[model samples]
Target: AKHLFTSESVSEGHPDKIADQISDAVLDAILEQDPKARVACETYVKTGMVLVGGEITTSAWVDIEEITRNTVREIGYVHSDMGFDANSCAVLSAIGKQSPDRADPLEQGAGDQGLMFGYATNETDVLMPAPITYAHRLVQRQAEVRKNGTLPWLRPDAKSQVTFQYDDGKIVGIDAVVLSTQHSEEIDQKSLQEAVMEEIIKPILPAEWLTSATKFFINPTGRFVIGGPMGDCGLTGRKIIVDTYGGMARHGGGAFSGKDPSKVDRSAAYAARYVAKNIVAAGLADRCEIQVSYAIGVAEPTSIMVETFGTEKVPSEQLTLLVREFFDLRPYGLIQMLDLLHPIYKETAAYGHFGREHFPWEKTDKAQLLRDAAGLK
Candidate 1:
């Protein structure tokens, strides 16, 4: 049975990503000074303006305006010709204190009530789905080349879509590759397309998966001279699917950026990935997805479950028990297990979160322990 799986990724200069980065930057700044600060920052970016409004509780004083400008600047949006310049944009904030009603410190209880999902697969070396892994690498490569001077005409705004042919749950070939990148007016459409194919797409996508039949769409609409917040209104949490498994797995309808670890949306999702990855790494499953739900102000998960798509060596029930025993799905427990109180989320805003190895949740440190517990040979 052959099927096609597609995933998309955006660059840091993408408008929605810009907002996510700003919100997380503020969260990081506050956390660096006050690890215990309660933060739920939201940012909005548009043509020549940025408005940051969210509830935050902290004793640390940070210049929100400076952080906003710096985040935009870091994304390569410093020049006005890029549509939204870091130095010229108007930065406004409507930040307020976290509501005291649910602010009672129950040793870091769940911030809000919602479901969160974590996923993994053995199809790729990183245990991530190949469609998303390649999709992310495409844009990430765009950024690298742009910053390293290989593509000097490239702007910060870009997107990549990858569709892979799958047969018997294994990737057989690539069906299509699409990359729409913002560029300077100097590069014509034909030159942009050729450069994107030769330098960006060729080096990142596996040559084995590409063939003459593969469809390549670089700058599909022809001209992309204007991008970023100039032509779009960017909001935080808009790219939830891109942030996680790229629609290959179900999400709990919660976004990861801006909120602190106390929020199960961010921390529990990380814990779930850690749990699922360890299970797959232990050879208990070829693919795994876990769902954990929490209630606001509760320290423990209201519900925890695991699904292996009939690929589990052990019964799903037994695997669930192992997860409960080996990992902490609770709010505070997740923070301690993953060390989530740091300023590390700005990077997660663009590329998919599950495939990257540097993230603590991406670690398979518990694989051996889980394997031993399962008695797997």
Candidate 2:
């Protein structure tokens, strides 16, 4: 039977992404000085103001105001005409010391008790679902065109959705694409639509997937001149779907940005992706999803499970055993395994987190390891 699957992505200037970036910026700044800093920063932006509040315990001194403004400035929110100016916007902080009970003297502990899921599929070269991979590319193209002056009228805020037509569990063509971008009022609909199709959509989408029946809806509702924080409030962790598998896989509802690696919600989730990707890359599964859980103040994971959707070459129980043997699911182990305690989080605030090659968790170095352990040829 033919079916449809859809995924969406957002530009860095989107309200939720603005908040995510600010929170990660603070986390990075603190990590630079204090490698073991415990941070759980949350950022909120609305109209003319930005507020940061979270539990953080670190000896490092970071200028939250400067960091917040600098992050916004980098995201193209420097001018007042953009609705929220980085220089003029109010920045406030309500950070406090980390709760002592969260960690102990002997070893690092989980920041919070939570479950996380990670997923990977062989449908794309990057081991990502095709719908999400293309969805991210569309929004990424929007950012590139806006920043490079290829489309001067293009504004910072944009959203992209990709719907794929599938048959027999494989994607056959793109059914539709929706790219709604905030633009300057000077540009008219006809001009904007043509420019977006040529500069943003046509260049990013593969021609083979674009059938005669493919539909493109650009700014379907019309005016989007007013955007950014002025038009809508921004809060951290609101784009969790965009941050992960793009709704292709189930999420445990934990947000990644503004959190240190000690938080199982972030670290464990990353580790699960690392493990799941390796399993698929090793040819043990065509697709993989892993779930892991932890308890506060515990170094070891409380539970670990895997699902291969019947694509596993071996028994599910054996695959589960192989994962336990090859990867460390504990909080401290995950941090060391992925080297995640650095200031590398800010770059992952937007454009989807799972597909990039630069992120350590996205590496498939462990694929051979898992393969050898599974005794597969």
Q: Score each candidate by Cα lDDT.
A: 0.88, 0.89
Candidate 2 Cα misplacement greater than 4 A, ranges: 98-109
lDDT of 2 by residue, 75-144 (tens): 8877777788899899999998753343533256676798999999999989999888988999999989
**Whole-model lDDT for model 1 versus the true structure?**
0.88
Q: Could you give me the TM-score of model 1 versus the true structure? A: 0.96
lDDT of 1 at 42: 89
Q: Could you give candidate 1's per-residue lDDT for residues 1-377 as a string of tens digits? A: 99898999999889999998999999999999888788999888989799999989888889999999999888988877788899988999999875334253335567689998889999999998988899899999999999899999999999999999999898999999999999998899999988998899999999999999999999989889887999799999999999988899999898878988877888888888889999999999999999899888777778988889989898987888899889877687788889888888777777777888999998889999898886767
Model 2, 109: alpha-carbon shift in Å?
4.4
Clashes of each: 0, 0
After the best TM-score superposition of candidate 2, give how far the Cα of residue 306 lies from its true spot, in angstroms. Answer: 1.1
Worst-scoring 10-residue span by lDDT in model 2: 98-107
Q: Which residue segments of model 1 deviate by more than 4 Å?
A: 98-109
